Every structure is written in C-alpha cells, then in structure tokens.
From a paper:
One of these highly populated repetitive folds is the αα-solenoid (SCOP a.118), whose most widespread superfamily is the tetratricopeptide repeat (TPR; a.118.8). The ﬁrst crystal structure of a TPR domain showed that the repeat units are helical hairpins, stacked into a continuous, right-handed superhelical architecture with an inner groove that mediates the interaction with target proteins. Here we show that such hairpins are detectable and that one of them, from the ribosomal protein RPS20, can be customized to yield a TPR fold by repetition, with only a small number of point mutations that are neutral for the parent organism. We concatenated three copies of RPS20-hhta as an initial construct, connected by the TPR consensus loop sequence (DPNN).
When we studied the melting curves, M4N showed cooperative unfolding with a Tm of 77°C, while the unfolding of M2, M4E and M5 did not conform to a classical two-state transition, consistent with an unstable molten globule-like state. We obtained crystals and solved the structure of M4N to a resolution of 2.2 Å. The asymmetric unit (ASU) contains three polypeptide chains of almost identical structure (all pairwise Cα RMSD values below 1.4 Å). Notably, all three chains exhibit the desired TPR architecture with three repetitive hairpins, which interact via knobs-into-holes packing between helices Ai and B(i-1), as is characteristic of TPR hairpins. A superposition to the CTPR3 structure yields Cα RMSD values below 2.6 Å. An unexpected difference to the canonical TPR structure is that the stop helix of M4N is not resolved in any of the three chains. However, this missing helix is compensated for by a specific dimerization mode of two M4N protomers. Therein, the C-terminal TPR units of the two protomers form a tight interface, in which the B3 helix of each chain substitutes for the stop helix of the other, mimicking the capping effect of the stop helix. Analysis by mass spectrometry revealed that the M4N stop helix had been partially proteolyzed upon expression of the protein. The geometry of dimerization in M4N has not been observed in TPR structures before.
Author numbering:
A (entry chain A), C (entry chain C): 1 to 106
B (entry chain B): 1 to 105
Amino acid sequence: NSIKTLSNLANLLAQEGKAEEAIKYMRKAVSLDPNNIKTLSNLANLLAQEGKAEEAIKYMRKAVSLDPNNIKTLSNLAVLLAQEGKAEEAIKYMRKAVSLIDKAAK
Amino acid sequence: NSIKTLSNLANLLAQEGKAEEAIKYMRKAVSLDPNNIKTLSNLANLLAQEGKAEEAIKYMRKAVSLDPNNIKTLSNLAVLLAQEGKAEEAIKYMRKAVSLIDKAA
Amino acid sequence: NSIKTLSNLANLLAQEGKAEEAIKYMRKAVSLDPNNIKTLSNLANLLAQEGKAEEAIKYMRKAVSLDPNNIKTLSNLAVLLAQEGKAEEAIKYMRKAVSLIDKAAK
C-alpha cells in the first residue's frame, strides 16, 4: 500500500526464498516512483542477490544517471561491473568516485 | 536462532530504518563468528547507518584485514572513509581496488 | 493413533507418495492436538505445496491466533498472503512480526 511497505514485503519474501514474488513486489515499489534512487538501489541489490547481475547493473546505471555525483552509487555500480568482468567500466566509475572524493578534499 | 537467522532479523529491522535494534542482532551474529566478513560488513554498514561512523570504519577495517584483496570490501571501506571526510584513505583503498581489477584484467 | 505415528506416516506419504493421504493423516494429527502449532504449520505447508492456498492460509491464521507473538508464524502467514495476492493483509502481518522483532531487542 506504499513504496516502503512493498519494499519491506519484497525483502521478507526474498528472505524466505520466494525470489520471483520478491522481485515482483520490488518492481511494483519501483513502479510507484521509477526515479527514486533508493528504491532503484534496493531493486538492483535484490536482483544481484538473486544472481541477476546484468539487470542489477542496468538499474544501478539508472540510479547513477539520476544522480552521477553520488560516490556510493558509483562505487556499488563499479563493484557489480568488476564482479562481472567489465574491468574498463568499473575502473571508469571508480575513477569518477575518486574524482568526487578529491573534490570534497579540496 | 543461528547466524543466518540473526542476520535476517537484523536486515528486516534495517530495511525498516531501525538501525539501533538491528545492530543488536548483528552484534549477536558477529559474536557467534567474529571472522565472518559478511556479518562484519553488514554490522559496519548498519553502524554507519545509525551514525556511528568511526566504529563502522573499525569493523570494516577488520573485514578488510581478514581478506585484504577483496574488491567489494575495499570499495565499501573506501566509501565509509569518504563519508567521514577521510579523503586520502578512501582514495588509497579505492586505488587498491582499482589495481586489483586491473590485475584481474 | 499417536502423534508420532501420524506424523511419521504423513511424512512417509509426502516424502514419496500421495500428498492427499499425507494431508489426511496431517489433519488427523491436527485433530489430535489442535493447539499444536507445529502440526498446523506442517499441514499449512503441505496444503500450500499441493496448491490449496486458501486452506493453508486458514490453518496458518489458526496457528497465528494460537500464538500471536510468534515471529515465524506471522512471517510465513505474510508470505502466503503475499503469494496469494493479498498485499495489504501480508504487509499487516509482516508489520506485526517486525514490531515483535524490534520489541524483542529494545
């Protein structure tokens, strides 16, 4: 009945091994607001948890696109890309994160 | 109860934004096995979520120390450090992760 | 007609044989101790796996009403409801369970 409740429900479903249903509900949560970076990150984390790494990368990329100066999102995307063997992209986003950290340092 | 079930309870709480109690459950889970990097990382992130940045960095440093060449762990530590304004450290570990990715390539 | 007998038999039937007969003897086991939440739980699980969702939900609701402070029972009920399409009810019972988990800490 709300984004948060559908997300938590999806999480509970995932814990009990109900992968398909979990993804279904998490996708509903995203559908209520497709531009919510938090929900997108949650869905990407669920998809990655269920071995669907490419979709996870897709939604992480969208989350990045919505706010590209987000060090955390960049790092997560980079880790996912690295795990899947996409070295150049991973190093790219990690270097972006480094650049932002540098900006904060100065 | 087991480490897995404790972690599940803790995550159910963490998803609700209830970091304070979730940290209690995760502390139990970590107590059952102090060298589990998964549980250590989860506890660290929960502590950062609650607002205990330095202690989070501590547990993350332990997680790193147990398996120093792990890209995910390194990146996570880098993020936690960057959140606390410790730029040089963060960039250092991030660069370490980068070099590992490059080595794998 | 002991509970050990009935459960041994039901398990023997479900493990390799008819799910229906196993359900029969699980019903017998439940009738033996209607306040036994483990028997109700097993019955609900078997009924669910056989495709009898509403019935599973019935016995799980019964189990819940038998011990309202049981986290596992509430979680499983919420799972069955969410799987059945009842998102509001499921979210309600998840909320009860989570409230219990939280209270058990603080």
